[PDB]
Each structure stands twice: as C-alpha cells, then as structure tokens.
C-alpha cells in the first residue's frame, strides 16, 4: 500500500495558520519521487536529507502539516527564523529533518470582495515552543489596568483576517503550504521508500 499523500496535497480546503492541521503517515510505502519531480510546486526545500535519498530511507513515523499564508510569508517557515508567523502561529525546531513545500492557490482561496475566512494570530503574551498550537480568542491586555474581555486601546482582539482578493500582487496572493517531518527511534520503521 502507498502512503495517502492525495489526502494531504489534493484536499479541497486548508487550515488557518494560527490553528494549523497535522496528519500522521504510518504503515505504508512513501513514493517521494511523485513529489520532487512535480511541476505543481512554487517552492520545495529539504533540511538534513536530500530528496533523492527519501526513496531509500525508512522512518518510525512521518507527519504532514497543512495551512494557508501570504506569498511573502513563506520565508518565515524555516529553522532559526523570526516574525509574526514564526513566533506566534507555527514554530519549527532547530533539529528539523524534513521538507517545506508551497504553491500559489489564488484561484482556489481568493474571492471577489476578499476571502476573510483565513486568519492568523497577531497577538500573544509569549512566544511558541516548537510544534505548539492554540485556539483561545481572549483579549490581549497591555494597558495600565486589566481589559476584562472588552476591546479598546492596548485591549486588542488577538486574531486578524487576510482578506484575499483575486487581483492583488503575487506577494499578497494566497499560498498553500505543506511541511513534511520525518521521525526515527529505536522503535521499528513504519514508513519506507519503494524498492
């Protein structure tokens, strides 16, 4: 049985980046040659491992993470980087062994008048740990007194929408992103490349 990469890369819809999705890949054969030969991708980069070697390697687990961001923000998805996405929405560990893959989704994820369903987290009282996630929409407070859940100056709602219109410049157009992470322990391999 081949691994279910069609449920990852060919789904209809993707998560908002503050509430990013993860999927586990196990007990299957991973034909990675399908991915790195594809013309579908506007960016494809691997860390710790070369793409051609993924056909030979074996892993205890594999994980696939999925979300939508702006075309300019993709550069914040790398080990050691900092910014609104890297600090408060999605954090990679310094040991990251895996690949980052992205493609333009303007015809899917934009709409006339702007698609406001996609959100990111603009505020948080402290930075994320690697692979941390959150949901709670509590008011960010930084004023002289507590905000008590009421909006105002230094009493801010923590999330902001992207608002993708169909005709904006390529750095403001929506991009779909997949991050693949490879895991190996003393516990036996459950994913391998084909032979």
């Amino acid at each position, epitope marked *: 049985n081949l691994c279910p990469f069609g449920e990852v890369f060919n789904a209809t819809r993707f998560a908002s980046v503050y509430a990013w999705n993860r999927k586990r890949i196990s007990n299957c054969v991973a034909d990675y040659s399908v991915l790195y030969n594809s013309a579908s991708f506007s960016t494809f980069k*691997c860390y710790g491992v070369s*793409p051609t070697k993924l056909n030979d390697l074996c892993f205890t687990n594999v994980y696939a993470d999925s979300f939508v961001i702006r075309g*300019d923000e993709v*550069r*914040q998805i790398a*080990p050691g*980087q900092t910014g609104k996405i890297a600090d408060y929405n999605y954090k990679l560990p310094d040991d990251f062994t895996g690949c980052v893959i992205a493609w333009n989704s303007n015809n899917l994820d934009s709409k006339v008048g702007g698609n406001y369903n996609y959100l990111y987290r603009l505020f948080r009282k402290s930075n994320l740990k690697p692979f941390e996630r959150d949901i709670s929409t509590e008011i960010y407070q930084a004023g002289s007194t507590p905000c008590n859940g009421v909006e105002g100056f230094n009493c801010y709602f923590p999330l902001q929408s992207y608002g993708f219109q169909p005709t904006n410049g390529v*750095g403001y157009q929506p991009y779909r992103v997949v991050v693949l992470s490879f895991e190996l322990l003393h516990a036996p391999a459950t994913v391998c490349g084909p032979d």
Partner: antibody
Amino acid sequence: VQLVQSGAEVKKPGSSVKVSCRASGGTFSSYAISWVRQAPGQGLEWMGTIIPVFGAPDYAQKFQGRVTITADESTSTAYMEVRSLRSEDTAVYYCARDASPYYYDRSGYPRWAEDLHHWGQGTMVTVS
Amino acid sequence: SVLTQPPSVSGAPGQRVTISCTGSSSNIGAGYDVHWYQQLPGTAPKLLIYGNSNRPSGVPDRFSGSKSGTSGSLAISGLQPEDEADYYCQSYDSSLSGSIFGGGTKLTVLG
C-alpha cells in the same frame, strides 16, 4: 550566536594580510560564513562564502585569485588571506552569517540564503 | 551595474520618508528578492527587512517594504532623529554569481 573578529593591520604594498573570525553560542558546521568589505566612505562589497561541512568557497570575480577563504571544525573559526596588497585594499573587513542551516534543493544541491542576520565587529586593514 | 539607489533623503519629525532601489534584467528583473540594512557611524550594518517585506523580531513597526516591476522600496514612518543612518539594499545576481548591494542613502531629519 555572536561573532568575534581579529584586530587591525598595517602593511606595505606587495605584502599579504590574514583576517580571522570565531562563532560562539551555537553550531558552526552547517551554516554559511560570508566575507564582506567596506572602503572608507563607500558601499558594501561581497568577497566570498564558505559552508564548513563542504569546505570549498564561492568567490566574487574581482577578488578571486588575490583572496582565499578557509575554516576549522575543531575551533569554530573561519579565516581569510588577501595577497599582493595595494593602497585601495585599505578597508574594514567583516565576517557575517545566515540565520538558517544550508538546505537541499529538488536536485539535491546544497544551498544558502543571502540575508546577513549576524555580523562580526570588523577588522580595519591599512596599506601604506 | 549594481542596484541604483539615491545618495540621501529627508523629512520632518512624525512624517513618512520613502527610499527606492532599482535593478536590471538580471537580479530584481529575474524575480529574486530584495533585503534592506541600516548602518550607524563607526558601526557594522544591521538587517531591517528580508524577503521583500518580512521584518525581523525587534525591528520597530514603522519600517515597511515591497518589490514591484524592476524595483523595491523602503518606507520609514513616524520619523524620529534616531532614524538618521545610511540605508543599503541587497539582491542576488545570477550574472555575478553572488550578492550585489546598492550605493547607500543617508537619511536626515529636517529639524
């Protein structure tokens, strides 16, 4: 991550100069180190780049042949030599470094990013 | 040859000031990104923007930037006397096989 760099130089024309840099507070081996120059009152100039695990540098065409770059795994240190000096080689030289490790593209070639996130204190070299 | 950039700019306190940087068919015209640095006197350069518009953590929120056509731009906003420095742009050039830098721009406050 903090860069620390060699002290200043005074030399006659046709002599040669050694410049050096050290990394601290993180991994040395997987990160690109780049050498930059700045003449007095003038814009920045890129000389060349090394990744220690591959050892062979990239060089800018103006500096290739007069300049050579090198690094040590055991001491977390990078070095440069400039040869056959002339008066216009009077400048401040900086080491600088990427914020991410090198990466493999779709064809398996190692690559590095042109952003200089971290900078050394700079070495003033002077030619009489 | 290298990225073309104006020698100096100026504005009043609390105003916006815009610095421009422009390439060729190589570099910015080949679709490569542009990055921006600041230099104070006697001191090594500091990064302000990467990836056309990404701003590091710890850079203040007045600095914004973009890329369009064969050009990129830096905007300084809510201007203060602390913002007097020399500003450089950078991009990759596939016809040089390495980085290229602009000629620099000294900002000045009008007082």
